Design a protein around this ligand. Structure first.
Ligand SMILES: CC(=O)N[C@@H]1[C@@H](O)[C@@H](O)[C@@H](CO)O[C@H]1O
Ligand SMILES: CC(=O)N[C@@H]1[C@@H](O)[C@@H](O)[C@@H](CO)O[C@H]1O
Ligand SMILES: CC(=O)N[C@@H]1[C@@H](O)[C@@H](O)[C@@H](CO)O[C@H]1O
Ligand SMILES: [Ca+2]
Ligand SMILES: [Ca+2]
Ligand SMILES: [Ca+2]
Ligand SMILES: [Ca+2]
Ligand SMILES: [Ca+2]
Ligand SMILES: [Ca+2]
Ligand SMILES: [Ca+2]
Ligand SMILES: [Ca+2]
Ligand SMILES: [Ca+2]
Ligand SMILES: [Cl-]
Ligand SMILES: [Cl-]
Ligand SMILES: [Cl-]
Ligand code: NA
Lengths: 154, 154, 154
């Protein structure tokens, strides 16, 4: 009986694993995930960049990053309002990098941006990035609060 | 070795438990749950209060209860139509109580309400409570059908 | 030792089964599944009929099928755009059948449809069906791309 029960629990475990995989697949689908496309999700809450990174990390995803015009539009649509992007120049001023490492391969900066502005009064300049009107990018204070949009693999 | 096999399966189970918790957190996030805020959800189905309590309990949740003006607005936005609240004066006419216990702390009654109206000729007065698109409360018959909105802990 | 651990593992597995069922129930509820009604879900992606079938099947559901005017309205509500239905006459031209088997009963064809049109130039006639804007049906090429909408049991 002991070995028979053990073999059954292995089957129970494998069955639950496939069932949870199905649950995740269905959830992604109902939330709009498209075939061969990473999917962006948000709870529409505004918060400082540090909280956005922690929260997406907690969800096993990353802070949304547009790699091309298409993805930039996808993120804009999900957010509906201004959201943070996983891009910053905290490591080297003026040199924007993906929070997930590397130099930029695509950008959609607003005219006269990035300008590492200090006038906001929160302290320091501007090392974070958010997507504003018309999907254009603006460098903004990481201390500022904007929409949290997380990314999951295609 | 059965002991090793058993240890290995315990580990597999712990991983599934972690993945399921992740699934639950992502679902809430994708549905708009705010940090430190309660999670209100609805299927937009109107039904008698009895139905709503049973439904929310089945989901291990409870009928939505606004504890302040903020939450009242949040519930209003999710329901988008008239929704029952987890408040009734069924036990003792005149003394409204939370379905989860205790005397009302916050309220937002409409003018001329509660009137424990009997004119609905549906049987008895009005011992339940529902919200209107305006956000104000009105006592209504528990036998009437209104939107089901369940809440989950912050 | 061994037998006690096995008993606890059985218990751990059952609580996991229980929690997963609850996750599935909550997901459906939050997506709008009405009591005693089947529930329709879509990711708003357009794709050839064979892909829609494959996808719904992967999710343990089937391509949406309107069995009456109410369900037809429900499906158009969910689709928001032209979507394929689980109905075709691929087996025997002129005799529409449900993908899950059986001859078509309730129908809601647009005037002058079905017409097994060839002029589309995709090759062959029209053996699939899609619901357009207004809820009416049209036979269309199974090779054309339309919104994927899956249904799950009441
Ligand atoms: C939301 C936004 O774009 N803020 C920018 C700020 O980052 C800075 O560039 C400033 C320059 O004066 O202009 C503002 O409009
Ligand atoms: C939706 C609503 O407000 N219903 C109320 C009803 O509860 C009762 O108070 C009645 C007075 O006869 O007035 C109605 O307007
Ligand atoms: C979308 C739609 O209704 N397409 C139809 C097509 O199926 C075929 O019937 C054709 C014949 O003139 O008319 C088109 O309007
Ligand atoms: Ca079993
Ligand atoms: Ca900077
Ligand atoms: Ca700037
Ligand atoms: Ca009473
Ligand atoms: Ca009363
Ligand atoms: Ca009243
Ligand atoms: Ca335990
Ligand atoms: Ca045909
Ligand atoms: Ca046609
Ligand atoms: Cl900064
Ligand atoms: Cl009553
Ligand atoms: Cl065809
Ligand atoms: Na979900």
């Amino acid at each position: 009986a002991i070995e028979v029960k053990l073999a059954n629990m292995e089957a129970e475990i494998n069955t639950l694993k496939s069932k949870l995989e199905l649950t995740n697949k269905l959830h992604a689908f109902s939330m709009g995930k498209k075939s061969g496309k990473k999917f962006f999700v948000t709870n529409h809450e505004r918060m400082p960049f540090s909280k956005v990174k922690a929260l997406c990390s907690e969800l096993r995803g990353t802070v949304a990053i547009p790699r091309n015009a298409e993805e930039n539009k996808a993120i804009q649509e999900v957010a509906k309002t201004s959201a943070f992007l996983g891009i910053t120049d905290e490591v080297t001023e003026g040199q924007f990098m993906y929070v997930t490492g590397g130099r930029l391969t695509y950008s959609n900066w607003k005219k006269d941006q990035p300008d590492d502005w200090y006038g906001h009064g929160l302290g320091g300049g501007e090392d974070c990035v958010h997507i504003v009107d018309n999907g254009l990018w603006n460098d903004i204070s990481c201390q500022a609060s904007h929409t949290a949009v997380c990314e999951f693999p295609a």
